[PDB]
Each structure stands twice: as structure tokens, then as C-alpha cells.
Amino acid sequence: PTSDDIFEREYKYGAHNYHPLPVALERGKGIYLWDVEGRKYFDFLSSYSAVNQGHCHPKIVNALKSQVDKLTLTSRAFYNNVLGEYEEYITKLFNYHKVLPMNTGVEAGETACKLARKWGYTVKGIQKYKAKIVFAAGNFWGTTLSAISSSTDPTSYDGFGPFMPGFDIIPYNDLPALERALQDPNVAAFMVEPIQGEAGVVVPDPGYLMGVRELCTRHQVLFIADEIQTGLARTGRWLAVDYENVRPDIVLLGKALSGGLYPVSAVLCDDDIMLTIKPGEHGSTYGGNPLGCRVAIAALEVLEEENLAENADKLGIILRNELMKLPSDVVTAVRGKGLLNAIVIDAWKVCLRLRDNGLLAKPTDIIRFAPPLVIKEDELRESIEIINKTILSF
Amino acid sequence: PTSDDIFEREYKYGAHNYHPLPVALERGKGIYLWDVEGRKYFDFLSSYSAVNQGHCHPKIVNALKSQVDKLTLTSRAFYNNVLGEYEEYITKLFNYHKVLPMNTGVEAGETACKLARKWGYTVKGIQKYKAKIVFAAGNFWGTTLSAISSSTDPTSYDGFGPFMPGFDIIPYNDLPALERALQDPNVAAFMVEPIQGEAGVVVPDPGYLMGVRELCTRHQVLFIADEIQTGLARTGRWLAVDYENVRPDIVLLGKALSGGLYPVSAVLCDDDIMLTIKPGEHGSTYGGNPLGCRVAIAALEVLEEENLAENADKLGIILRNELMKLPSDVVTAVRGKGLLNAIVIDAWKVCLRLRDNGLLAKPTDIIRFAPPLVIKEDELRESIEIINKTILSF
Numbered sequence: 001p002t003s004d005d006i007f008e009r010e011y012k013y014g015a016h017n018y019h020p021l022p023v024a025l026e027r028g029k030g031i032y033l034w035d036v037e038g039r040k041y042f043d044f045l046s047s048y049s050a051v052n053q054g055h056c057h058p059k060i061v062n063a064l065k066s067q068v069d070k071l072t073l074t075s076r077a078f079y080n081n082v083l084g085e086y087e088e089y090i091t092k093l094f095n096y097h098k099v100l101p102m103n104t105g106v107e108a109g110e111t112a113c114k115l116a117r118k119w120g121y122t123v124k125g126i127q128k129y130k131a132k133i134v135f136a137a138g139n140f141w142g143t144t145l146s147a148i149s150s151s152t153d154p155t156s157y158d159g160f161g162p163f164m165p166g167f168d169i170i171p172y173n174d175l176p177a178l179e180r181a182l183q184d185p186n187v188a189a190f191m192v193e194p195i196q197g198e199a200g201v202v203v204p205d206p207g208y209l210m211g212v213r214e215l216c217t218r219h220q221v222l223f224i225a226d227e228i229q230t231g232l233a234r235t236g237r238w239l240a241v242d243y244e245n246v247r248p249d250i251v252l253l254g255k256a257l258s259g260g261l262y263p264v265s266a267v268l269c270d271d272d273i274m275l276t277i278k279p280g281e282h283g284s285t286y287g288g289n290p291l292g293c294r295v296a297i298a299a300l301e302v303l304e305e306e307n308l309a310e311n312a313d314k315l316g317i318i319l320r321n322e323l324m325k326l327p328s329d330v331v332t333a334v335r336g337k338g339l340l341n342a343i344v345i346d347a348w349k350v351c352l353r354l355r356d357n358g359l360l361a362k363p364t365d366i367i368r369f370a371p372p373l374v375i376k377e378d379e380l381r382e383s384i385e386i387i388n389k390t391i392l393s394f
Numbered sequence: 395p396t397s398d399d400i401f402e403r404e405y406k407y408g409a410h411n412y413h414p415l416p417v418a419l420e421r422g423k424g425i426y427l428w429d430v431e432g433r434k435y436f437d438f439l440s441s442y443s444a445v446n447q448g449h450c451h452p453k454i455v456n457a458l459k460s461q462v463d464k465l466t467l468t469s470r471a472f473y474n475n476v477l478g479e480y481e482e483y484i485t486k487l488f489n490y491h492k493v494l495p496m497n498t499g500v501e502a503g504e505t506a507c508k509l510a511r512k513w514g515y516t517v518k519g520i521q522k523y524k525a526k527i528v529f530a531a532g533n534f535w536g537t538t539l540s541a542i543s544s545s546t547d548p549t550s551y552d553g554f555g556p557f558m559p560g561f562d563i564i565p566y567n568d569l570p571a572l573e574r575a576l577q578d579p580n581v582a583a584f585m586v587e588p589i590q591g592e593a594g595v596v597v598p599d600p601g602y603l604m605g606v607r608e609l610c611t612r613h614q615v616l617f618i619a620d621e622i623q624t625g626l627a628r629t630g631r632w633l634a635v636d637y638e639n640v641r642p643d644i645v646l647l648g649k650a651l652s653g654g655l656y657p658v659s660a661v662l663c664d665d666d667i668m669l670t671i672k673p674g675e676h677g678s679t680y681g682g683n684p685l686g687c688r689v690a691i692a693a694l695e696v697l698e699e700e701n702l703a704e705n706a707d708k709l710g711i712i713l714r715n716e717l718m719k720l721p722s723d724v725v726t727a728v729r730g731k732g733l734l735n736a737i738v739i740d741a742w743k744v745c746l747r748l749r750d751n752g753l754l755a756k757p758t759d760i761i762r763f764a765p766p767l768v769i770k771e772d773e774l775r776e777s778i779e780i781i782n783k784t785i786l787s788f
């Protein structure tokens with residue numbers, strides 16, 4: 001089938017919850033994607049930061065192909081041989097006692113909210129059901145009814161109420177607002193992204209995450225760090241929170257935890273939080289399955305073995321420096337850490353022409369530039385010239 | 395590692411949200427599982443009905459191995475060549491206009507609730523935010539904050555509030571209660587399982603689903619059928635609702651939609667419901683990815699090509715008939731449709747001894763008996779004798 005045929009078939013038989021950029025891909029490998037006409041493209045979205053390791057990374061592929069012949073799903077009604085090996089590996093990597101395995105990023109966020117409330121009631125001693133969770137304006141952590149209840153984007157929540165109670169919102173990047181909010185003794189947790197991704201790569205000021213950690217500790221509130229997009233080398237560190245040497249109470253991972261080969265998400269925290277949830281209190285059919293666990297071990301090993309944090313750091317400096325040379329009259333701002341970057345400009349027309357010139361990006365007047373972390377400098381510099389050609393063609 | 399080593403390692407590094415039956419599996423194929431000591435077992439849980447096609451079905455495995463070398467995740471920011479082919483296939487199979495792809499069963503349920511509310515406000519004309527959704531006591535559809543808010547199991551919701559408003563509960567298998575509930579003009583939907591699985595294989599009376607359909611139509615309420623566990627040949631029909639020739643407004647599928655090789659879930663409904671959700675209003679990173687889509691096509695083709703509905707029907711009759719010969723003094727009840735069955739009996743001690751005798755089951759005083767649908771009569775009769783040996787050894 002042709003590209004238009006592909007667009008039309010989805011239009012007929014699939015829900016219209018997305019309006020994708022009109023490009024139809026059939027193969028991907030490393031930093032590249034090819035459409036059905038055979039044209040090649042640089043991938044500068046990385047599937048919302050899930051293919052940090054590049055598309056179809058052979059080590060992760062090999063892990064999938066090995067385990068799929070053995071065993072793919074027991075459910076957690078029984079034990080399998082893989083899960084505990086993955087749990088020991090990942091908990092030691094990030095230095096938390098335990099992990100709770102789930103499948104999608106929003107599932108990890110839901111899990112963290114349950115953890116926070118159960119901890120609020122049974123350890124902090126908040127009365128049922130007065131526990132509150134604080135969120136930052138611009139947050140994105142998924143599309144469930146709980147997740148849209150904390151959103152400040154009307155596209156997410158308008159028309160879908162009534163909303164989950166017990167969720168408060170303050171501005172991002174704002175320590176006085178957090179301090180004022182945590183005067184309320186019924187707050188159990190503050191959940192926040194170290195860099196807000198879907199909001200448009202909003203980078204907070206130096207010292208913000210240090211201040212969050214101090215304030216949360218000072219008021220005995222759990223600091224939930226959502227690293228589903230910012231984590232796993234994307235910003236030039238293992239976790240973006242590492243830039244300020246801050247240790248959250250709960251860390252969320254997803255997306256690139258599998259290199260894009262399987263939906264695997266993780267909730268990391270110590271025993272004093274994790275063991276508030278008892279047997280039977282939190283279930284998921286596929287969470288912790290052995291196929292996804294093998295895939296995730298390999299996906300994490302790739303990030304470590306190939307020094308992708310260091311590459312993302314070095315190449316991100318080059319990327320932002322060159323984007324800053326774009327005319328201030330057309331590109332109003334450049335921002336990012338590592339290889340999570342964006343420019344401010346419409347943005348859709350820009351992305352259509354980037355596509356024409358061989359580079360795939362999507363707007364979120366903001367264009368995100370997030371290639372896989374396995375990109376090399378010469379490939380990055382070639383990509384930058386496509387961005388320049390495109391911006392300078394208007 | 396030994397079995398005890400496996401138990402201890404998960405105990406140290408993994409959350410305690412499950413207390414699994416103490417058996418440690420490393421391989422599965424068809425109806426069988428093997429533990430790390432090499433012992434072989436009949437699987438009578440089928441991973442909560444996700445391996446209807448049997449473990450590691452070669453056709454589904456081959457689909458996974460083929461696509462993983464090509465392309466695994468673009469995100470829905472762009473098109474890929476696989477998704478629309480899967481969408482056209484599945485919508486025609488069940489005769490709905492469109493499908494909305496998600497990953498887990500609870501994600502499909504969350505999606506249906508958003509659909510119902512958005513439809514309630516914009517098509518039925520309910521005022522914001524007075525839309526209600528009705529659920530049945532005993533329902534299970536996942537572990538998110540919205541899903542536990544409609545539960546009547548205190549293990550699920552106690553300690554996790556405050557709860558999602560707008561959710562009402564009535565008894566299962568109760569047409570007068572549904573009629574009374576739907577006198578409220580702000581109900582947008584009634585969500586119900588055709589057979590309640592996690593509640594203990596609670597089978598409603600003949601005519602219940604016919605009565606639900608009539609009542610929902612009479613009062614312009616959406617009938618949401620949760621077939622994530624009962625669907626896909628498990629009960630001896632494509633959908634359990636087919637036993638009463640009833641067509642819901644929204645059908646949920648999950649679990650066996652992938653044969654256990656990938657978390658794939660589906661929301662099926664016609665354009666008058668589905669198109670209430672617009673671009674940007676409902677997102678999921680992995681939903682609709684091409685790897686899961688290839689896997690699901692193959693998983694569905696297996697159910698059709700191997701006549702597993704018919705096998706589950708015929709063998710389920712044999713299974714229930716033999717279980718009914720167990721002493722009334724020990725087994726108080728037998729129930730089920732197709733190969734979703736249970737007996738009422740503690741049940742944990744029974745399952746420990748079934749395990750000792752080569753058959754794996756889990757309690758939910760209720761023991762579920764749900765082997766893969768590819769089981770043959772001689773294998774089933776051999777399994778039945780293990781159940782007999784075990785029950786009669788007490």
C-alpha cells in the first residue's frame with residue numbers, strides 16, 4: 001500500500017485520538033526510519049523518547065527472540081525465573097530497595113499515587129481520605145481519569161469529568177509556591193518532572209530540584225520524580241535528577257526501559273514506602289512478565305555499555321549551540337538538556353517541510369528535537385543542516 | 395538458581411503486591427509449564443486467560459520475530475504500515491466501525507469510561523459534570539484509582555481514597571436493579587462482565603444480557619461489555635455475549651488478544667461513540683505499535699483457524715460434568731461456560747497439593763479451572779484425574 005492508502009485505512013477503521021504527521025513508516029534501524037515509498041529520514045522524536053537506544057537495537061532484539069521461545073507470560077499468580085533477576089539488577093542500578101513492575105508510564109504514575117496515599121494514611125497518619133497529592137502546572141503523566149484530573153491542559157480534561165479529588169496544582173519551577181503548598185499537613189506527595197516533556201521541554205532553574213528535595217524532606221512529603229521521559233540517558237545523565245545530585249522517594253521509569261520493543265514501566269522506592277502495599281492490593285496481568293523483563297535488562301545494559309549518557313551530553317551541547325545561530329526573528333528560544341531539546345517558532349508547517357527534507361519531528365509553536373542517543377556527531381551535524389535548510393527556506 | 399532462591403530474590407528486590415503460589419516456572423509450551431527443577435505441570439490458570447492459544451504458540455512467535463527485525467515503535471505521532479491493517483481486520487471481525495488501541499486491560503476500561511462521559515455530555519446532553527457510570531458488585535477491571543473506585547472488594551480500594559466520583563454500583567445478575575438505576579437521566583453507561591472472572595466465575599442467569607441490552611437501549615445508556623477475560627473463545631464463543639446474541643455499544647478486549655506475547659488491548663465501538671474523542675484528547679505511547687499489532691493479528695487468526703471456540707465449548711461440558719461427580723460434601727458448587735470454570739471448596743491447601751500432583755491453579759474458597767483452549771480431550775481427562783486424586787486425598 002501507498003502512503004495515502006495507509007492514511008485512509010486508519011481514518012476509516014481507527015479512532016481519531018491522534019492527528020499524526022502525514023508520513024507512513026515501515027522500517028527503522030538506529031537513528032533512521034524509512035517510509036513505504038522507500039525514503040529515508042532522521043528520527044528526531046525517538047517515539048517520545050522510547051527509542052533512546054535506536055530502533056531495533058540488535059542486543060535488545062536478540063534478548064526478545066531468545067526469551068520468546070522459552071516463556072512469555074505466567075502472570076504473577078506463579079513465579080518465573082526472569083523477574084527477580086531483573087528486579088535485582090534494576091534496584092541496584094538506581095539504588096532503591098524494591099521495584100514494582102508495570103507496563104505503561106501512566107500505570108507507573110497511578111501506582112505511585114496509590115503508594116503515596118497508602119503511605120500517607122498508614123505511616124504519616126493522615127486521616128482517611130484527606131491525603132493530597134501536589135502536581136505542577138504543565139505536568140503530563142498519561143491519559144487515565146486520574147492523570148487528566150491533575151492536568152492543566154484543557155485538551156486533556158475538558159469534557160471528561162467529574163475529576164479525581166485530592167489533587168492540587170502549583171506552578172512549575174517555583175519553590176515558594178511549593179513551600180506554601182506544603183504547609184498543608186495532609187499533603188502526602190509532590191509529583192514532578194525534572195524537565196517537562198510534553199509541555200515543550202520546560203527546563204526548571206538550577207537549584208529547583210535541590211529545593212524540592214529539601215522542602216519535601218522538611219515537611220515529610222514524598223518526592224515523586226517522573227523520569228519516564230527524562231530518564232535513561234536522554235538528558236545526559238542516568239536520571240535527569242542526577243544533575244542536582246538529588247534522590248527522590250519514588251522514581252518512575254518507562255518508555256526507553258525497553259528500547260521500544262515492549263511496554264515496560266517501573267516504580268522504584270525503598271521498603272518504608274513500597275511495603276505499604278500488601279498482597280492482593282495492586283495487580284496487573286502483564287506487569288513483571290519474563291519477556292518484557294529480558295528486554296528491559298538488555299535495554300538498560302545497552303545504555304550503560306555504550307556510554308549513551310555521555311554521548312547525549314556532548315552532542316546536546318553541539319545541537320543547542322548550532323540551533324542558537326538560527327535567526328532570533330524566526331526561532332525565539334532554544335532549550336533542553338542532553339538530547340531532549342526544543343525550539344520555539346507555524347510549527348506544523350515547519351515539520352511538514354522538515355519531513356520533505358528528510359527529518360521527522362512533531363510540534364507540541366514548539367518543535368521538539370530528540371534523536372536517538374546512538375547518533376554520531378557527523379550524523380547530528382548533517383541533521384542540523386536539514387533544520388537550517390528548512391528554517392531558512394521560509 | 396533453585397526455586398527457593400527465586401522466591402527469596404523476588405522477596406528482597408520486588409514489591410509484595412502478590413503472594414504467588416510457590417512454584418517457579420522457566421518454560422511453557424501449549425498447555426504445559428515446567429519449573430526450574432524440570433517438573434512438568436498442566437496450566438489451569440492460563441495466565442488469567444491470556445494464553446488461550448497456549449504458551450509460545452509458534453504462529454504468534456513467528457509474527458513477533460518477523461516484525462521485530464523491521465520496526466517496533468514509531469509512536470502515533472507518525473503512521474506505520476501495520477496499525478491500519480490490524481484495525482481493519484479486528485473491526486470487521488467483531489463488526490464495529492472503529493477500534494481504539496491501548497496496551498493493558500485497565501487502559502481499555504479507562505478509555506471506555508472517557509468515551510462514555512464524553513458521549514454523555516456531547517451527544518446525550520448530560521450537563522457537565524453530572525454523568526454517571528453504573529457498575530455491578532463484584533466487578534474487576536484493573537487497579538488504577540478509577541478502577542478501584544468502582545470495586546466492591548475492600549482489598550482493592552480500602553486505604554487508597556478519596557475515590558473517583560460519578561460511579562454507582564448495583565448487584566450483578568439483577569435486571570430490576572438495573573432498571574431502577576437507569577431511571578436516573580444522568581447515567582451515561584453501564585459497564586459489566588458477561589461472566590465475572592476475578593469474582594470467582596460468577597455466571598449470570600439466562601436472559602440477563604438480553605435484559606441489559608434492552609434496558610440500556612430503552613433508556614439511551616451505553617452498554618459497555620468487558621470481555622477482556624471472557625472473550626476470544628474462552629467461554630466457547632468468540633465473545634461470551636454471543637451466547638445471548640447481544641451486541642454491546644462498546645466491547646473491551648485484552649489478555650489473549652496477543653496470546654500472552656505482548657500487552658495489547660482494544661476498545662471497539664461505532665463512529666457515533668468513538669468520534670466523540672478528537673485528536674489530542676487520548677494518548678498512549680505504546681498503544682497501536684506495529685509489533686503488538688502483528689502479534690495480535692496472528693493471535694486472532696489462531697483462534698479462528700484452530701476452531702478454539704468450538705473446542706472450549708465441547709471440552710467445557712466434559713470438565714463440568716466430571717467435576718460435578720466430586721463429593722458434594724467437599725466441593726459445594728461447579729460453574730462456568732466453555733473453559734472458564736470454578737469449583738467452590740482451604741482452597742490454598744488444595745492448590746498446593748494440585749501443584750504437587752502436576753497441575754497449577756490459584757484460588758480467588760474458590761478454585762478456578764481455566765486451561766489453554768488448545769487442550770485435547772485426553773489431556774483434559776488426565777488433568778481431571780489429578781483434580782480427583784487431589785480432592786479425594788483429603
Ligand SMILES: *Cc1c(COP(=O)(O)O)cnc(C)c1O
Binds near residue numbers: 105193
Ligand atoms: C508519556 C509519559 C507518561 C505516560 O506514559 P505512557 O506510557 O504513554 O502511558 C508519563 N510521564 C511522562 C513524563 C511521559 O512523558
Ligand SMILES: *Cc1c(COP(=O)(O)O)cnc(C)c1O
Binds near residue numbers: 284503621
Ligand atoms: C484483568 C482484567 C482487567 C484488567 O486487565 P489488566 O491487563 O490486568 O490491566 C479488566 N477486566 C477484566 C475482566 C479482567 O479480568
